[PDB]
Amino acid sequence: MKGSSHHHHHHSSGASLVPRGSEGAATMELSADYLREKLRQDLEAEHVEVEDTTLNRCATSFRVLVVSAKFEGKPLLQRHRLVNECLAEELPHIHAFEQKTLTPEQWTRQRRE
Incomplete structure (x- = not known):
């Protein structure tokens, strides 16, 4: 059908063509280091550790760790909500x-695992 209108002309875009590299699976898109570095610099932490259960599988999960005081200044719920934002x-x-967010004193206090 063509009752409801919205766009008379066709969509357009702009992308210059230059030599460098082609596309792939997700070597650059969606990665542990991507979310880790992003959160580290975004949240500005001291020590961070990211993990993954291998994307090549039925189930996929990502673990991120951050240790600093910047989280202390903000509420407990604000910390988790911050990473989600x-x-x-x-x-x-x-x-x-x-x-999982924590403080440098707590971590250094008891860091067995």
């Missing part, structure tokens, strides 16, 4: 995400 668009793509 950053990867808000990426979150939906993550089948399973798990983050």
Whole structure:
């Protein structure tokens, strides 16, 4: 049907063609280091550790760790919500995400694992 209108002309875009590299699976898109570095610089932490259960599988999960005082200044719930706000668009793509924020004193106090 063509009752409801919205766009008379065709969509357009702009992308220059230059030598460098082609596309792939997700070597650059969606990665542990991507979310790690992003959160680290975005949240500005001291020590961070990211992990993954190998994307090549039925189940996919990502683990992120952050240790600093910047989180202390903000409420407990604000900490977790902060990490979610950053990867808000990426979150939906993550089948399973798990983050944990703590202080440098607590971590250094008891860091067995």
